[PDB]
Amino acid sequence: IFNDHLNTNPKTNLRLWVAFQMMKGAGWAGGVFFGTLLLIGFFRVVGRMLPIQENQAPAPNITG
Amino acid sequence: ADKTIFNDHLNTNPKTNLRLWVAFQMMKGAGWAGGVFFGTLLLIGFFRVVGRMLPIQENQAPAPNITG
Amino acid sequence: MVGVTAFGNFDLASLAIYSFWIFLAGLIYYLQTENMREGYPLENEDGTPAANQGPFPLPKPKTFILPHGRGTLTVPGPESEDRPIALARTAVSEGFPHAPTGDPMKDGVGPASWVARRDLPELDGHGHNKIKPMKAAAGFHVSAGKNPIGLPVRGCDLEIAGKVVDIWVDIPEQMARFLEVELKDGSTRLLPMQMVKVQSNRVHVNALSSDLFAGIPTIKSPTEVTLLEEDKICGYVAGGLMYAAPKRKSVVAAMLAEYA
Amino acid sequence: MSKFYKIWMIFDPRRVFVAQGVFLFLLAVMIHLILLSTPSYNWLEI
Amino acid sequence: MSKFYKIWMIFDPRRVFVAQGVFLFLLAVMIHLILLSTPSYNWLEI
Amino acid sequence: MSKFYKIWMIFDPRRVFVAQGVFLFLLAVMIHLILLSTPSYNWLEISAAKYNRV
Amino acid sequence: MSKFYKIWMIFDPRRVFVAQGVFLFLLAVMIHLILLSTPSYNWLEISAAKYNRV
Amino acid sequence: MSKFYKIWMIFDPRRVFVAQGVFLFLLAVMIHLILLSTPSYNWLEISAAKYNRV
C-alpha cells in the first residue's frame, strides 16, 4: 500500500534484488556457522562447571 | 531510469521487495559512513608508512609537554 | 616601577590587561551595533515585527550622500521588499522552508532571487557608464588569454545555445564583465564572466541548459545595462545551479541520482 | 507499545532509515575503538 | 573479457548467486580460522 | 499535569523529537564515559582484575 | 505572585521555554560536577571507600 | 521614588528584563564561587571537617 518504494528506478531495484539473493544464501551459511560456534561455547561452559581443574587425565594418544 | 529488459526480478512480491529496498536505503547510508572511516584509516596508515621509511628511530625528540 | 603592586598582585601590567578587557567589550558592542544597519528590525515569517529584537539596540541613523546627484541614503530606516514574493509556507510553525508556488526561476525566489535595485546604469567617477560593450568602447581589445568572441556557447546539457557576439567591459577596472550571446532566434542576451569556462573550442556554461537560454532577462538599451537588469540576469543564471539540476547532463550527478 | 506504528505518520522512512544506518555504524565503530584502546579487551594484544 | 556476459546464457543466476554466497562465506571463515590457528596473526593473542 | 499536552501547541514535534534524541544519546555517552574514567565502576578494569587479565 | 502572568505578554513562550530548559540542564550538570570534584560527596569514591572496593 | 515608573518610557521591558536575568544569575554565581574559594565559608569543606569525612 505504501507504494513510495516504487519510485526508485528499476535497474537499482534489481541491483539490490540480487544483493538480496546471493547474500541471503550465505546468510544461511552464517547462521550455520554461528550455531556451531554457540554449541561449542555451551559445551565449554558446561566444562567450566564440573570439578575438572582439580584432577585431569594424561594424553591418551602419545607423541602429540 | 529506463525499465530493465530481464523483468524476472519483477516476480518478487512487493513486501519482500520492500524488505530489501529499505535495507538498501539505511545501509547505503552507512556504506558511505564506512567509506569515510576507512579513508581516514588509510590516510593514517600512509603517514605511518612514510614515517617508517624515514630514520626517526635512530634519532628522536623528547616529549614536548610534561609527563610525556 | 618593576615589581611594585598597588594591592594583592595588581600592578601596572594587571591594570593594562583589565583596562583592555573593558575596551574590548566596548569595541565589540560598537562593532555589532554598526553591523545592525541593514535588514533590521527583525520580521516574522508573515511580515509583522517580531517579539525578539536582540540584546543590541539599533544604532543612530546615518546618511550617505551618493555621487552624481543620485540622492542620499539613510540607514537604518524603513526598509520594504518593494516586490511580491511567490512563496507559500510549508508548515505553520516558525523555522521551516517556504516552497515556491509557480516557477522559481521566473518568480525570482530561492537561489534565483533578485533585489529591486535602482533602474539606472552604474556610473564611474567621471559620469560615464562603468560597463560598456567593447565595440563601443574606444581603444579596448583582447590582450591575452583565449579570445571568446566567435566561439559557440554550450549549455549544461551539452547542446549549443548560441554564439558570442561581443564582450562587455568595465571601463575603469579594464576587466571584462559580461559576454553577449546571440541565440538561434537572433536575439542577444548577457552572461556574467564568472559563470563561463572559456575553453579552447567553446564557451561552456554549466549553470543553464540550452533550452533555458531564452529565459534570461533582456536590457532596454543595447549600449548600457542598469543595476536592476544586472541583478535580474545574475540571479537567473545563478539560480540555474539549483533549479536546472534535472536537465544538467553530468556523469557524476547521474550516478548519484541512480544511487539514490 | 502497539500504537508505535504511528511514528511513521510523523517521519518519512527514507530519512529515518538513512539516519539510523549512519548512527548504528558510527556507534559500532566508536565502541570497537574504545575496546581497542584499553590494554585489556584489546583483543589484538591479548 | 567483453563477451563474459554470455555466461548468464549458460547458468541460471539464482543457483549461481546462491552458490557464490555460500562459497564466499565458507572461504572467509576458513581463512580467518587459519589465521587464528597460528600463534602469530592470532590477533586475539597478539 | 493533565494540561501538559498543550506544549505541542507551542513546539513542532519534529524539532523537539530530533533535539530529544540527540540530547538523550549525548547524555548517555557522557555518563558512560564518566563511569569509565573512575578506577571503580570502570567495569572493564573491575572485571580484568577479577579474572587477572593483567 | 499577583500579576506575574503578564510576563508572557512580554516574552514569547517558545524562546523562554527553550532558554529555561537549556539553563536548567547546564546548571544541574555544573552542580553535579562540582560535587564530584570534592573528595567528600564524591558518591562514587566514598562508596568505594565504604564498601572497601579499593 | 514615585516617578520611577517613567523609566519604562525610556527602556523596552524585553531587553531590560533579559539583561536583568542574565546579570542576576551571573552575580549569584560569582558570589557563590567566591565563597567556595575561601577555606572558610567553603561550606563543603566546613561540613566535611565537622563530620570527619576525611
Next chain:
Amino acid sequence: ALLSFERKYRVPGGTLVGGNLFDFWVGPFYVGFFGVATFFFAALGIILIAWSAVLQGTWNPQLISVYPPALEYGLGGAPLAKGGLWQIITICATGAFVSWALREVEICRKLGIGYHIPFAFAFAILAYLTLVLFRPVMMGAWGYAFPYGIWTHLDWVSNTGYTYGNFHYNPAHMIAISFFFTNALALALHGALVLSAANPEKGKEMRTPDHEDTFFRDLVGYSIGTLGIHRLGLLLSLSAVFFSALCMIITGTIWFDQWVDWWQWWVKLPWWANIPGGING
C-alpha cells in the same frame, strides 16, 4: 527572527544528505544533518573538557589541561584518566570541524553562492590535523601532540621549538611568517581604504572605486583592484597556513638537528666556501 529580506531565500533543497529530515532552522541557525552532528560533537567535547577538569582537581579555566598519552603508550590507547580523555576530545573536535565545513557547503548550495568558504576552512582543518594527527603518527607517538589547555599548549609550542634551537632558522617557517605579516598588512590597508571611500571627509559625497585606485596609485604607484585585493587576501591567508603546515611536517621527520645547520649549505657552496673574511670564515 528573520531579517527584513531573509524570507525570499528560505527555500527547500540544496542539501547533500538527509532530504528534508533536518532542513529546518532553529532561530537564526540552520540545522541540517551536519548541524546535528556538529552540535553533538561540540557538546560532548565541552562536557569532556569539564570532566577532565574535575579529574585534574582544579576549577580555574586557565589551568585546565588535557594532556595526551605519554610516549610510553606509543600510538595505542591510554586510560581515560591519563590519556584517553585527550583522544576522545580530539576525535570529537575533528568530527565537529569536518561537520561544520560540510554544513557550510549545504548553506552555500541553498544560497547559490560559490564554495570558496568551506574550501578555505579545509586549510585550517588540515593544519590542525597536521599538528594533532599527521605529525604524531609520522613521529610515532601521541605524546608529540599538544595538550588542550589555554596556557599549556604554549608550553608545547615552546618545548617543540627549542628542541631544534632557534626555530626562526626554518625556511618553510620564514615564508609562513612573511605571509602572515603581509596578510595583516593587506587586511589593514583594505579595510581602511574601503572605509575611507565609503566614509569620506565630513559633508562630502561617497567616493567611488576610481578614487580608491587613484589613492593607491598616488601612494605606491600600483593598484590591484577590488577583485584583485580579495583574491590576494584569500591567497595570502591560505599560503601562510599551507607553509606553516609544511614547516611542522618536515620538523623532526626529515630534519633532526638545529635548524641553522640547514642554512649552512649556502655558505658551503664551492665557489665561496673557502674565501676568508666575513662572518662565516
Next chain:
Amino acid sequence: DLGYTGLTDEQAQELHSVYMSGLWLFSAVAIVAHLAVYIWRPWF
C-alpha cells in the same frame, strides 16, 4: 495591554497556570531529592 507577543489575557493566564503547575511539580521532586540526600549525608 502591551502584547509584544500577541497573546491575550486569557491565553496568558492559562499558560501561566500550566507553567506554574509544572514548576511546582519539578520543585516538589527537587525537594524530596534534597531531603533524601540530607538524611543520607547532611551538609550542615
Next chain:
Amino acid sequence: DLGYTGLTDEQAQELHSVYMSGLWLFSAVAIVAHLAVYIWRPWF
C-alpha cells in the same frame, strides 16, 4: 485557543498520550537496568 504549530486539541492529546506511553516504556527499561546494576554493585 492559542495556536503556534497548527495542531488541534485532539491531535495534541493523542500525540501526548503516545509520547507518554513511549516515555514510560523507556523509564521502565531504565529502572530495571538500574536495579540490576545496584544489585550487582551498589553505589550507596
Next chain:
Amino acid sequence: DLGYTGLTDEQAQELHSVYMSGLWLFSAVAIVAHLAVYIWRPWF
C-alpha cells in the same frame, strides 16, 4: 492524522511491521554475538 509526510494508517502499520522485523533480526544477531563473547571472555 498529522500527515507531515503523507502516509496513511495502513502504510504506517505495514512499514512499522517490516521495520520491527528487521530490528528484531538485528537484535537477535547482536544477542548471539554478545553471548559468544561473554562465553569466550566475560566482562563481569
Next chain:
Amino acid sequence: DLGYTGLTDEQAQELHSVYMSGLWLFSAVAIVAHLAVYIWRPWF
C-alpha cells in the same frame, strides 16, 4: 544462442554489467582492507 536458461543477448549483457559492477565494488573493498592490514602488519 544455446539458450539453456532462456535469456536473450540483451538480458545477459545487462545482467553481466550489473554483476561485474557488484564484483568490482566487492574487490575494491577487499583491496582497501588488505592495504590496511598490510600497513598494520605486513606478511612479506
Next chain:
Amino acid sequence: EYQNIFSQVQVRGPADLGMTEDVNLANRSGVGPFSTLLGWFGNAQLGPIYLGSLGVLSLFSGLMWFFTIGIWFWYQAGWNPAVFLRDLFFFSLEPPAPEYGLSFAAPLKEGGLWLIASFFMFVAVWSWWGRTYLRAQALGMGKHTAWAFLSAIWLWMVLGFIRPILMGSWSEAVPYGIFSHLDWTNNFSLVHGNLFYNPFHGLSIAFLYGSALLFAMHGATILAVSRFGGERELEQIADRGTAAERAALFWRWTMGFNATMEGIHRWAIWMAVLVTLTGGIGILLSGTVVDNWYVWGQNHGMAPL
C-alpha cells in the same frame, strides 16, 4: 567549474590617469607599462605615482638608510663581492654597546653608524606617514589608512626608540640584519622569561590569527558572491543588491550573526590594528614593569605552580 581565482581573458585600453580634485597633477608622474603577468591576477597598469615634497624626502631618507646599511655590510665583508653574497644574511648593524648607555659617544665602527641609520629610518617612516595622510586628504577621503599606519608605527617606535629610552640604553634596540634581528627576538624572549606568558603578547597573537581568519573568510565570501557582482562593494553599500544579502544570510545561517557590506570592513581594520596596538603595549611593559613573565604568570593563575 570556474573559481574566479585568475582571469581567463584580459582586455586593455586607454590608461586611467586617475581622478583630479585638490591634487597637483604636475607631481603625478607618467603612466608606466602594462604588465600582463600582474594582469592575470589584478590590474595590469602600473603608475602614475605621486611624487610630492614628502615623497622626495621619504625617498631620500630611505635610500640613505638602505645605502648606509649596505656600506656597513660591505665593510664587514672586506669589500669582497663573493663574501658579500656568501654572508648577505649573516651581516649585522649592531646598536651601541651597553657601556655607552644612551650616549652618542659611540665610535663610528661600534655604534655611531647604527645611530645614523636609525635617524634616516626614523625620518623616512615619519615622512611616509605624513605622505599617506596628505594623499588621503588631497582626494577628500577619510584618514583611516593614516591611523592604521599609525598603529604599525607605534609598534615600530616602541621596539626601536621608546623602550631603549625607558631601559636607559641603546643596546636594547634591534640590529639591522636578517638573522641579527631574528636572534634579537629570540634573546628578547629568553631574557624576559617566556614571552608566551606575556598576556599582551597572547592578545597580539590572537589578533594576528584573527586577521588571517577574517581575511580568509572575507575573501572567500566575496569571491563566492562575485558572480552577482559583489566585488563592487561601494555600490553594494550604496544600493544593497542580492550579493550582500546572500553573503549576510550565509553567515547568519552559519554562526547566528552577520555583518553588512560596510561593517565587515570595520571588523577588518580593527582586527588588523589591535595586533600592533597590543604588541606595542606588551613589549613596552616587558623589562620596564616585568622582568620574568613566567613568574608573573605563576603569580597570576596562568602557570601551574
